[model samples]
Target: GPVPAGAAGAPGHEPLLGDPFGAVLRRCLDGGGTRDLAFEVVERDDGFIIAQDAGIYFAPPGEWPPTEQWAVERARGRVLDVGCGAGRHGLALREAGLDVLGVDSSPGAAEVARERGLDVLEARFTELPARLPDGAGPFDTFLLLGNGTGLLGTPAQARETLGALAEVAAPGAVILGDGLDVPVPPDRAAYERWNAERGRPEGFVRIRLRDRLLVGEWFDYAMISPDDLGRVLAGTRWDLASVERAGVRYLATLRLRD
Candidate 1:
């Protein structure tokens, strides 16, 4: 694996970026990193078990294909799935011949991911349990699927998340994932123009609406652009590899280095 880009930061750890969203996201996700997180994982895993079609499954009316499908062109060995919601992408990774370990804060997710037969860990990527299935060093790939990048709620979390990405990756590893693009629904350009009129940048955050929920039904989010993702990654510990789209969301595959 290659060293991640932006590995220039201090080694080991650093303070989180300051912002209300970052604070709120970490607090919400970490609140039960050890407990109720399990219940959610269980429910999610059960859904996968009952679904029958090995393809991705979402609660009815909440149907959206797994977000990762557009980012990674293929799967290979030794993969780490960040935000391994219900193990969908991890399963695809496993099938791709990689020794995959799926990580999520929710035990419900871990259970289902494991049931799906992929190695699943219930832990935060920034602060994982002492042990891991793939062990440490040089995984060929790491994923921030299911709009997992949003976990880094603020710009600083974005930086640290990239650092952690660098810390855990083997030199030459590739990272793939999607970013939020304000709040425009797919195929809507008028609203896109409306947001632009307000000085909001294209593919920038659109302050999540109170009623919308995403990420395995865990979060509400806006959208962001490939350019926004590029700005975020350029100085981080990884070099931007590719930024395309599965649809409305921006899909990225990055090369890790320092």
Candidate 2:
């Protein structure tokens, strides 16, 4: 697989431009106020940008959306918190007395997580198995909260990630993830037209994060609906066991196929 954009040593990739979100996390951890720490999610094709609060990464479990809170409650045994950002979910799970290890691609984010007393590995999700420590797995539950389903990237990457997880998953292990449902009427029509023009799958969005002077390289993020998620899991080792909806956001429980 090609090295992820902005990853160290990848030709033409800027290391300093790799982790805008991590930069935000570091700023928040520095005791500097979050007032000017808002970041932008810039859509690649069109220059559309959405501003997001950095404080969301540090939100307590009580402030989490219902679907995310529900998904976290479902975690069991040892857990792998993919794209753990500032380790919010991992910290919450640890407080519940569950062993949790976080994996993130951003060095600054992982460092902040460590400073918060959570165990974290600084590596992308696709780099699993290779970067995971010797005793790290057979993880019993995989927590992909904070719309972490996006971390799976496109469908092909999702398959690759699921396959990698199967190699380390304990028997009957499960993945508890949250994702957005399909867009409403107006946005849905626009997305359909946009996807059609680009030959991209529906829900596949190209975006990058920008904070202050840091701008991350563009990456694909999928906003999968429950049905589409099932399709993505069809040939993988996981099976969609149940979906709990909270408005447009939903939590999915995927049990390992026996």
Candidate 3:
């Protein structure tokens, strides 16, 4: 079995994720692989469409235009890149003279990250305290870029992930990452129904690698609005520090309440 059901609060309850995307990304980062690969985002009625950013597995620092340089420029001491795809954020901060550690459940991605010289660990975010290096936490900065906040999975697990982050972060440490805002009228109703039916918060999106069909857990991701973020932090020692709009996405910063 991949993992227990309770491990994932979403459907299929499989904690083991088979990453065709990460495998492709790992291949591409090896020099000749083109950035032409794409993945599908499963939609209503089990429909899906190709996405452009699906191949952004090894994006360079200058290619972080979507985040508007907010994460890199503002990053500080001992950093943790949760769900760190290819170690882009951690690598960038490491190059800037900060101690950085990256973590991801994708074995391929984690291997690629370690190949790039990052102190990366292949494990789930909640497993960090145990899996990371000795003296690894109480980090000053926790990065969740590339829409990493969405990787928190379900509303219940999202809360768990936030609490875990608080545990790993130092007092008053900063948590920076990007997330989606609530959709507008065009698809708001469908979006609301989608999340409501599945016990997710507003903006929670379900996607999976197209290489497989109806075979595993739907990647439960969220585009947490500032309000929804508040809901997830209710019982945690973390509080919203600031959030800014970046087009349809948002950059959120959180600080330890203690």
Candidate 4:
């Protein structure tokens, strides 16, 4: 007999996940993983980095050059790189003479981020301390670069992630989330097809590349459009700053609404 869901030792239930990636992905997908329902799964030698970035950072239906625009405005103050994968942007910032803290939940990535000489913290965004003690001030600026928005899984969750940002950030801090806003993959079919083309097996549907090294999405089910992302962030605490696109990826800036 199959063990009941959430049963002790029946499956994964150990270690409480305040920002449960699997749970969030499941909620967005509405519990679909069959092969017959997959969405378009584009492939590349670079793996999910570009694809996820393309899907989450910018809404593909539009176009703009975000990096160029940012180069004009520039990042200021003590910066926090939420979901700082590989520390690429954070390292760049550190090199540019900005005080930066690169934060990532993944330990390996965090270690690499530390090696980049950026102050890297290995903890979830939700787990940040109430106040920045000692040297660090509540971050004046943040960048959830590399589609950490999608890494958290849904639009609402993304908002909640921002809300957490608001709580941990210094007064009047601004944020820019650059990521992929692609259509949620329908099912394992996308993975299966791509895999079969290469003689591999289907991967978990939430974020196929992360857990399985596959091409299709694993658990993200939210399709965040450019307008949708704008709407999601516009509120009493945040003002829509600018949303610049690069092909499918986008860098959307939101100033603190005060």
Candidate 5:
């Protein structure tokens, strides 16, 4: 709960960095002056969620969702944590003695992870092959939790990413992640068309964050349904190993095909 690195005391309610998402997170992590800070995601509308504490990003192990818990339970050997955020998952796995590498594109988030005492790399998922330490192996388990699968923005990208992941995974290594089912409502035509125009799967959302009038670009995030999950793995090196749904959300385990 120390003052996060790179945060400066500016004007009233002014964020510390250009990236409002990371700034707000840093604010929440700092705790005192900005303990009431909140971040928002602008998909359908500009509505956002407020997290007065940084715990939203760096959730303690006890508070992790059931799907994420299952992911950690299924993890083995070397682990690659993509979109590691504040390093909750990777740090937890390491505490149990797993060789782990946590990656996030945000430098600020990476700093927070490092401060939290984690071995994390500040890079994008696609950059892993080069950024990973030599002899990191062919990881045994790769993770993309917290709806991290959205990093594969399109079907083509999904295939490409799977191929790349296979190149770095131990033969038959599995990837664990969670996604929403995105059940189509009666009047979902406009929504479907919007996704179609953007070349995204159903339930793909564009997330935008705003704090102190600083609005960040809307980034695409996909929430794949059970049926489309097949399409994601169709010709990739991965095959669906298991899927368990709780209401509209699902925890999926996909293993490298032998």
Candidate 6:
């Protein structure tokens, strides 16, 4: 796993390739606990940072937010848990008798998911089909809960990734994806102006995950509105079937175009 250029810190410092998110999950799994496992989301451009609880990744289905629970309940047949950190959703679907395979880009995260009894692959969302093992899938459902739609990145990236996903998707497959309906800081006008200047979509963000000395690579993450998600789905193999909202977050159901 080569660290991307510019992702590295100063000499003697931990490499940016370290999996901070995965480390948090690994701690919880090892009973080291999450009391001090809070990680930070660093907004690349603005230097804004926010600490997020690591325990949420290990939450059981019963403890999930209503929209996340609803999306999980709709999973069917073989499911692809995209960005499946710690296998929470995949484990739940497996418990309910559905076949599940979780995919994560973090080796630590993938290992943690496996330790938790999930079948997981370490790969990015756009690297699917190629990364999937033989006889792995024609996945009936794609679980993108926990702001999984952010995995889609930008609109161009979404179109490309969705097209890649279609290669392994079964007929009539559905994607259960969720995302924030607005920017995190909620400064709509400022965000709009920032995005416009960058020629990016309204809620696009560049961020990295960090815990203590470990840092992940900076990546593009989007908090697309439902209408914006629809526009992104255009020219892809999927269609936005419906959207269910809970305050500023939303769950979008996407059906494979006929």
What lDDT does each candidate get?
Answer: 0.55, 0.82, 0.71, 0.55, 0.72, 0.83
TM-score of each: 0.58, 0.87, 0.80, 0.59, 0.79, 0.88
* lDDT for each residue of candidate 3 in 181-229, tens digit (9 for 90 to 100): 7554565577678768877665555766534432234567666677777
- Cα lDDT of model 1 by residue, 223-258, tens digit: 446666677776787888877665566667788774
Which 10-residue window of candidate 1 scores lowest in summed lDDT? 42-51
By summed lDDT, the worst window of 10 consecutive residues in model 6 runs over 32-41
Q: For candidate 4, what is the lDDT?
A: 0.55
By TM-score, the best candidate is 6
Task: Rank the candidate models, highest TM-score first.
Answer: 6, 2, 3, 5, 4, 1
Per lDDT, the best of the predicted structures is 6
lDDT of 6 by residue, 123-240 (tens): 9887897889989998999998888888788877888889878998999999999888874565656766887998977667778887767778888887778888898887788999
lDDT of 6: 0.83
Residue 190 lDDT, candidate 5, scale 0-100: 76
* lDDT accuracy of residue 177 in candidate 4: 69
- Pitting candidate 2 against candidate 4, the one with the higher TM-score is 2
lDDT of 2 at 162: 88
> Which of the two candidates, 1 or 2, achieves a greater lDDT against the reference?
2
Each candidate's clash count: 35, 0, 0, 21, 0, 0
Q: Could you give candidate 2's per-residue lDDT for residues 1-258 as a string of tens digits?
A: 765443234565543466777777887777542445544356454555677667778888888999988878878898999889889899999989998999988888999998887899987777888889898888999998888787788889899988888777899999999988866456556766887898878767778887665678788887788998898998899999999999989999999998
